[PDB]
Amino acid sequence: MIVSMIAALANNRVIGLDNKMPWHLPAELQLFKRATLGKPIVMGRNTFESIGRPLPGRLNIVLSRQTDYQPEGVTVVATLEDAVVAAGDVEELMIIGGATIYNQCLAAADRLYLTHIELTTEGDTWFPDYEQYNWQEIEHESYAADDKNPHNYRFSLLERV
């Protein structure tokens, strides 16, 4: 099983503000969907609340230590190890956030699916400093701003070296 993390970063690795993402960029969610459909997705409790529903076409695994926390349509696990057990023998597990989960799983990640957005915005959550490790890019895509998406963004799939 490949352990992958997927995130969208504005400048200075900002990923979140006030439990939402501080930009309007609907097409980027389509990128997220293409990259995660058919795979188990593992997330922290705040990220689940931010999404607001189980996502279709994916096994939704949510981390919480709250013993009575049990949203419909997701599997709640109390440890990372248990998340990995729920994911089963699949090709690739996708960690979809948020900061605390990214922090705990970075050292173990085989791939990062990063979208970089050309935007300086204030944050209260940041992606980890992945650049402390070595990576090679194995896929990439560029997306210039258009009438529905006001910022340039690009995709980079990194593999740990």
Ligand X SMILES: CN(Cc1cnc2nc(N)nc(N)c2n1)c1ccc(C(=O)N[C@@H](CCC(=O)O)C(=O)O)cc1
Q: How far apart are CA 77 and CA 99, in angstroms?
A: 18
Q: How far apart are CA 123 and CA 97, in angstroms?
A: 15
Stretch that binds ligand NDP, among 33-41, 57-65, 129-137, 145-153 (CB under 6 A): 57-65
50 binds ligand NDP (CB under 6 A): yes
Write the interaction track for ligand X spanning residues 104-143; mark x where CB under 6 A is met and - where it is not.
-----------x----------------------------
65 binds ligand NDP (CB under 6 A): yes
Q: How far apart are CA 91 and CA 1, in angstroms?
A: 5
Question: Is the C-alpha dihedral spanning 80, 43, 35, 21 positive or negative?
Answer: negative
Type of residue numbered 86: A
Q: Which residues bind ligand X (CB under 6 A)?
A: 6-8, 21, 28-29, 31-33, 50-51, 55, 96-97, 115
Binding residues for NADPH are 8, 15, 45-47, 64-65, 98-101, 104
